[PDB]
Amino acid sequence: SMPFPKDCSQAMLNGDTTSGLYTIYLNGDKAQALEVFCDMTSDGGGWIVFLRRKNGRENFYQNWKAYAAGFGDRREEFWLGLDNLNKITAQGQYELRVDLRDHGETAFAVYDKFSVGDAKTRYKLKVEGYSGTAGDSMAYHNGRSFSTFDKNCALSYKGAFWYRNCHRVNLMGRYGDNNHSQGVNWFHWKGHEHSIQFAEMKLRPSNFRNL
Ligand SMILES: Cc1ccsc1CNC(C)(C)CO
């Protein structure tokens, strides 16, 4: 086992094959502990979950400081935090996976290369190298800064995202809201008038597939 695993891939190889809450350590530093939810079952496991939508109990219409820090219940609906995502993705080359489920249908998207810049970049998104069944809806968002209502798509849609003008992905939108572009959307899967029931965004080292 690794004493200070830097992500869910290093926490898993530590033997723990059960999805749930684990401690990771940013840069392997025992003073930078972070409790994360690890999805240890999806496509070989080792995923840090950083967004979960599943029941509309949590408010995602939150401010910059809330999106920077993270909020919610890591066992239910939550957002891990942009500062956390920047620090994790700075540790090496990470891959993004998005799992979607709605009325029994499932889809996914994986991106070879996923990073989140620091606060000076307004947490700039990098997403490249798409594969999957959901359709490449993140390409639209590639290179965009993060936006919240207080830093206007976030206001007009009542969510938060790496908005452009405005979105093909809105996983932090209003739960159960089928009004055009207001809901939990993945446009190239279910369009803008269909709020998705279940959505997770998660990350692990891109080299995990052959480590
Ligand atoms: C195209 C694609 C989509 C998901 S994983 C993936 C492959 N990535 C590698 C292994 C070639 C480089 O890390």
Q: Within this chain, do residues 103 and 120 fall inside the same structural domain, yes or no?
A: yes
* Under 8 Å between Cβ of 48 and 74: no
Q: Where are the beta strands (DSSP E) in the chain?
A: 20-25, 33-39, 47-53, 71-72, 78-79, 94-102, 105-116, 125-132, 169-170, 185-186, 198-205
Tell me: do 76 and 155 sit in the same domain.
Answer: no
Rounded to whole angstroms, how far apart are CA atoms 100 and 169?
A: 12
Strand, coil or helix: 107: strand
Residues forming beta bridges with residue 78, ordered by sequence position: 52, 72
Burial class (CB in 10 A: 0-12, 13-18, 19+), 29: exposed
Amino acid at site 196: I
- Measured from the Cα of 207, ligand 1's closest atom is 13
Backbone φ, ψ for residue 37 (5° rounding): -90, 120
Name which of 87, 89, 54, 88 is nearest 72 in CA terms. 54
CA 112 to centroid of ligand 1, rounded, Å: 5
Distance of alpha carbon 6 from alpha carbon 24, whole angstroms:
5
Both 189 and 143 in one domain: the answer is: yes
Locate 152 and state its tokens: 């206007």
The structural domain count of the chain equals: 2
**Ligand 1 atom closest to Cα of residue 209:** 10
Q: Measured between alpha carbons, how far is 173 from 182 in angstroms, rounded to an integer?
A: 6
Residue closest to 138 by CA, chosen among 97, 100, 168: 168
Ligand 1 atom index nearest CA of 206: 13
Instruction: Please indicate, yes or no, whether residues 41 and 112 belong to a single structural domain of this protein.
Output: yes
Tokens 């290093």 -> residue: 10
Beta bridge partners of 49: 37, 202
Residue closest via CA to ligand 1's atom 12 equals 112
Method: X-ray
Is the domain of 177 the same as that of 107? no
Q: Which residues contact 100 (CB under 8 A, 6 or more apart)?
A: 106, 107, 108, 134, 186, 189, 196, 198, 199
Residues 122, 112 share a domain: yes
How many A from CA of 208 to the centre of ligand 1? 10
**Residues 110 and 209 sit within 8 Å (Cβ to Cβ):** no
Distance, CA 85 to ligand 1 centroid (Å)?
20
**Rounded CA gap, 54 and 101, in Å?**
9
Q: Are 13 and 166 in contact (CB under 8 A)?
A: no
Ligand 1 neighbours, Cβ below 6 Å, are 95, 110, 112, 129, 131, 206, 209
- Tokens at 84, concatenated: 């956390």
DSSP character for 3?
S
What's the rounded Cα separation, in Å, for the pair 23 and 15? 14
Q: How far apart are CA 127 and CA 143, in angstroms?
A: 8
Residue 32 lies in domain: 1-134+198-211
Same domain, 95 and 51: yes
Ligand 1 centre distance from Cα of residue 209 (Å)? 8
Question: What amino acid is encoded at 82 in this protein?
Answer: L
CA distances from 71 to 101, 108, 196 (A): 22, 24, 20
Nearest CA to ligand 1 atom 9: 112
* 3-state secondary structure at position 174: strand
Provide the greatest CA pair distance for the chain. Answer: 48
